[PDB]
Amino acid sequence: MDDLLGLLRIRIKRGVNLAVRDISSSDPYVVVKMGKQKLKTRVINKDVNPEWNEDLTLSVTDSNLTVLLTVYDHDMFSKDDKMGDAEFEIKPYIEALRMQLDGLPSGTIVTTVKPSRRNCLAEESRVTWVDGKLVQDLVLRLRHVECGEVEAQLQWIDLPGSKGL
Numbered sequence: 651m652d653d654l655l656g657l658l659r660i661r662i663k664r665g666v667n668l669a670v671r672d673i674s675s676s677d678p679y680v681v682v683k684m685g686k687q688k689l690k691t692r693v694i695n696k697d698v699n700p701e702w703n704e705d706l707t708l709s710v711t712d713s714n715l716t717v718l719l720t721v722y723d724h725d726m727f728s729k730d731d732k733m734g735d736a737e738f739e740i741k742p743y744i745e746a747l748r749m750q751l752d753g754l755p756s757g758t759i760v761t762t763v764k765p766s767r768r769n770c771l772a773e774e775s776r777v778t779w780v781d782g783k784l785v786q787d788l789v790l791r792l793r794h795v796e797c798g799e800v801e802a803q804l805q806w807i808d809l810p811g812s813k814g815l
C-alpha cells in the first residue's frame with residue numbers, strides 16, 4: 651500500500667485476425683505481465699477473432715512500467731504455441747491521471763500517442779476524459795507473428811489507503 655499508486659484495469663476487448671496454430675483455427679488466450687505480476691484471460695475456443703471482453707487488474711507502484719501482452723493457442727493435450735506479443739507504456743496514462751481534469755468537457759482528448767517503429771500501436775492511441783472517467787483505447791499489432799491485433803482499454807481504480815497518484 652505504501653508504494654501503490656492505484657490499480658490499472660486492462661480490459662482485453664478482442665483479438666482480430668489472430669494466427670492459426672491448429673489446423674484451421676486457434677484457441678486463444680492472453681497472458682499479461684508487468685513486473686512480477688502475471689495475469690491470464692480465459693481461452694476462447696476455435697476463434698481467431700475472439701471477443702474476450704475480460705478485465706484484468708494490476709497493481710501499479712511505478713509509472714515507468716511497461717505491460718507485456720502475449721497471445722497463445724491453448725492445446726489441451728500438448729504444448730501451447732505462441733501467437734505473437736506486444737507491449738505498451740503506461741506512463742502517458744498515469745501522467746494524464748495526474749492532470750486536473752475535473753472540469754474538462756466529456757469527450758476531451760488529453761493525450762494522443764502515435765504509432766512508431768519502436769512501439770506496438772496499430773493506430774494513434776487516445777487518452778480520453780469521458781463520462782467522468784479517464785480511459786485509454788489501444789489497438790496493438792502483434793509482433794513475431796504473421797498476423798493479428800489485440801484491442802484493449804485502460805481504466806483506473808483508486809484504492810483508499812494507498813500512496814495514490
Ligand SMILES: [Ca+2]
Nearest residue numbers: 671672723725
Ligand atoms: Ca495448436
Ligand SMILES: [Ca+2]
Nearest residue numbers: 672677724725
Ligand atoms: Ca489449440
